[PDB]
Amino acid sequence: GSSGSSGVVDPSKVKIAGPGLGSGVRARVLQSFTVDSSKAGLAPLEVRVLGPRGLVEPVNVVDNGDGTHTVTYTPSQEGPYMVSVKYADEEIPRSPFKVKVLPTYDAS
Template identity: 35%
Template sequence: MSSSGASPSPDASLASPTQEHAQVTELVVRTVIDPREEADKVRSNGPGLHRGVVGKPCYFSVDYSRAEGGKLGVSLVSPRQIVQRRAQLVRAPPESGYHYMFTPVCGGDHIVKVTYAGEHVPGSPFRVPVAKTSPTVQKNPMWIKAAANAAEVKCSGPGLTGGIVGRQATFTVDTRSAGDGELSIDVQYDKFVENLPKMKASFELNPADGSYFASYTTPEAGLYRINVMYGGQPVHGSPFLAKIEPR
């Protein structure tokens, strides 16, 4: 005997989802950029941020590759507004290895302002003392004339702890309280790598205060030893260990 009742239909709400159930709500997550934090990631270096001489180009670089969400601003204020245009910042030639340059036409303090996302980057504004003429230096200023005290040499700057491959790393060496001695600086990869010899760091006298501005550029990422010697002896803290990051 066949059943007189038909099988019940499945619940429509379970068999086929309604339009409301089928909709997918897209959640958009926006990252809030902190201008101050991003500006702190910018690095500025180069001799043009430390001193200059009238009539000679002052070079410096600004690395903002690790910052995001902001706009870089670089400006210059010279002691005399009347010569501001002649001392304005321009893009440096690529072969110089720097991003910016200016040629001061008068002595005195020049102010270089570097901002990112409207915030000053570390060190900015930079006070750049400009001398009217180059200091008188002996042809061989490194010649040892008296016993030197390497323990009195003071080294400081970001290049002593790190940098980026292919970009100039800088630091200062203050020998003013250490007597007369021979300064030498070399940079050595922390591990032996074939065909990668020691490199000599370049350094030059800062006419503003008599200290030395040193710089070096490494070909590969890794740990490097910065050996700073004065009067044949290592200075306090030498060798310094610098971590060079890839680009």
């Protein structure tokens, strides 16, 4: 049951689950995931994508309305990318995120 009166922000309660963060990512492909911060509080969510060499790519942020956030992006190229995420000026315990992008073409 719901009991207690507190309004603190817990950046350690926010998580993310989606294909965009998985290992099955391909370059020049639509990558998106879900950011659950309902247990974190009412704090904002920040995101950042850093290329393998040190490139800077933009990110999308959309509020679901229930208790999550959708972030769409597209890795111009492949390689060891890095998707950092913050919450209320506090780098979540799950960030940064090591996402190794793969070449649209699979060398079988």
